[PDB]
């Protein structure tokens, strides 16, 4: 109980495309379609997270007139060393009684910092990406919005009309197999795996989640001998790999991705990627179609172009004189692919005239306009525009 119209439009956001619906024996129908947003959401799998590390150093155990002993502790990057022949000083003199038989125990371990809850970079593994589109359709003089997955299976019914979007001609994605996410920025990075991090580089500190209990650390923590008569724990350690990455990361995918892709987070997605085409299937119901006999018959048609400028927008105006059989609504469509008309449907009655806006790139545009079921030839002499570059597609 209807008619299925199948059409293919280019995958470009912000451009209104016109399509002619011609059901045999029924008056033609014109539909205006515009892609509002095309979203490519990749399937994520979190490997690990990285943040700033915290070197936990307790008070050094200074043993006066005796030897200190280091015990092996199950802590990340745990370092322990006992220094002999120490003589430390405090505000009111020496801390130890002996001079040559005193020892100092220095111990330190690496763990996640307090900032890890707020400041962190997530290492994801991108899988098969899901495509979805938001389409604006000018159906029966009203604008309707259709949101569906671009897979050619998900059907969405809006005003008794069934819409099937896709499948996408190109399976292209700006993301690689391994991606890194920081706040609102996504980076294509071949990050080191879990338990294989290097000191001073991205992944020097690794953890499953920002609230996880266990932590992997490789920061090259080496304890040094303290200064003469000084109580302190000196150490040599490679600086934070996360802090170094924050200044060396460069430009994110929002600025580097091809086809003019817009990158958003929470969840991560590719928005408005101008790549390939998109097929659209519309199952228009029986009630929407009007018979050719029940539609007004157009006779004695003539066309005149009083103003034209060949631009990307509708820089042409056309006046079409007509003689109608009865009062009714008629569809307006350009039979020449080089010219596009702004109007889709206008009211027709008696011996009157209609005004239409058209867009063309040709200097001498000869096009045919189909009002209802009758055609009329238009002669247009279009002139060059003011600017060579435009800010609209």
């Amino acid at each position: 109980g209807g008619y299925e119209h199948v059409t293919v439009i280019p995958n470009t956001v912000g451009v209104p495309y016109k399509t002619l619906v011609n059901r045999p024996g029924y008056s033609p129908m014109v539909l205006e379609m515009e892609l509002l947003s095309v979203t490519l959401e990749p399937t994520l799998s979190l490997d690990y997270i990285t943040c700033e590390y915290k070197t936990v150093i307790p008070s050094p155990y200074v043993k006066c007139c005796g030897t200190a002993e280091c015990k092996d502790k199950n802590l990340p990057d745990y370092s322990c060393k006992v220094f002999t022949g120490v003589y430390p000083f405090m505000w009111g003199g020496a801390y130890c009684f002996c001079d040559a038989e005193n020892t100092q125990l220095s111990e330190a371990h690496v763990e996640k910092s307090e900032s890890c809850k707020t400041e962190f970079a997530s290492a994801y593994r991108a899988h098969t990406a899901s495509a979805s589109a938001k389409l604006r359709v000018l159906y029966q003089g009203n604008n309707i919005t259709v949101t569906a997955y671009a897979n050619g299976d998900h059907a969405v019914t809006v005003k008794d009309a069934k819409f099937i979007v896709g499948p996408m001609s190109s399976a292209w994605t700006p993301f690689d197999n391994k991606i890194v996410v920081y706040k609102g920025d996504v980076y294509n990075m071949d990050y080191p795996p879990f338990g294989a991090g290097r000191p001073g580089q991205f992944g020097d500190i690794q953890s499953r989640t920002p609230e996880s209990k266990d932590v992997y650390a490789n920061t090259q923590l080496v304890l040094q001998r303290p200064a003469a008569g000084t109580v302190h724990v000196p150490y040599s350690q490679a600086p934070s790999g996360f802090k170094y990455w924050l200044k060396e990361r460069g430009a994110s995918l929002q600025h580097t991705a091809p086809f003019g892709c817009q990158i958003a987070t929470n969840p991560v997605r590719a928005v408005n990627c101008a790549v390939g085409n998109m097929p659209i299937s519309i199952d228009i119901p029986e009630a929407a179609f009007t018979r050719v006999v029940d539609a007004p018959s157009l006779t004695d048609m003539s066309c005149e172009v009083p103003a034209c400028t060949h631009s990307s927008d509708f820089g042409g105006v056309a006046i079409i004189k007509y003689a109608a059989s009865k009062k009714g609504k008629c569809a307006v469509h350009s039979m020449t692919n080089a010219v596009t008309i702004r109007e889709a449907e206008i009211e027709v009655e008696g011996n009157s005239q209609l005004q239409i806006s058209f867009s063309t790139a040709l200097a001498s545009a000869e096009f045919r306009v189909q009002v209802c079921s009758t055609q009329v030839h238009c002669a247009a002499e279009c002139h060059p525009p003011k600017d060579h570059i435009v800010n609209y597609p």
Partner: protein, 336 residues
Amino acid sequence: NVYKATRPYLAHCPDCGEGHSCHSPVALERIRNEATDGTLKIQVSLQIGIKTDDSHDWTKLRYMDNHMPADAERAGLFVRTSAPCTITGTMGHFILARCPKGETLTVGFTDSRKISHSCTHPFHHDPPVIGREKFHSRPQHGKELPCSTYVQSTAATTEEIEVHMPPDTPDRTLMSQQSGNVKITVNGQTVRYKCNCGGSNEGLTTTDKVINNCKVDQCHAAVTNHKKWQYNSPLVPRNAELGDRKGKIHIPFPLANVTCRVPKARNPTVTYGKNQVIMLLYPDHPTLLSYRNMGEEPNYQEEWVMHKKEVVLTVPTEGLEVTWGNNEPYKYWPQL
């Protein structure tokens, strides 16, 4: 009140002034630069906003004076790198400050007597740029971007530090030469002593003791602090008597994700040509200029514009996207 148990302390400082090391009452412990906005979380040995009687007072700060804690003015407290810093938050051992580009960090104050006590540590300070424009003053209206800062709220609920009992404080004034013997004056304090002579040479005393046939240089005396609490500082030695006996206290000004307002650079005068775009840039401050092609080959190019510059860019059939600072990206397409 958590400050009744805790006390300000004396710790090691590599530079107290003129490149000389000392036992500083304003000694630096940890400097946190996790905030993207530029705010620093500085940890010191003294306590700000608390008096010696443990009562809260924002106009006063307590520091360790020789052996007993003393009161000092808040106005005298200063933070500096290469130029003086702007103080934003002060509570306990913590300091919040906005500092300019510097290679070192100094935290100082003026005590009861007009004498300046400072501590210098080598800390590379250069906060990263928020957005795409290098501005000086913060605007009231602008683009909202995600950033992190340490909240100026005095309440402590999230972050924490380790606290334990202080070690035996050495004091040479406890020992005196009584004719030809050592005299230890307790003065109502638990004293731990050790002598290089016979008999009762060592032990933990709560009363006055006399060491017979001994010299003052041959003995060592220290005061035990078991009544108060102190931060687990690597600049302070561990207590010899107790093992791994530790406690924990909540710390003010935790890191939280917020919003940073950035200004948008003025739109440049634009002129068009055959598959070409000309922009006459006028920056008031360093502004990032980036561009890419909207096709298969994007060819990303970026440059930090400092002053008046004219840019000639090519516009292909696929399109050209231009981003001028914090402004929304301009898109260009050729006619026909």
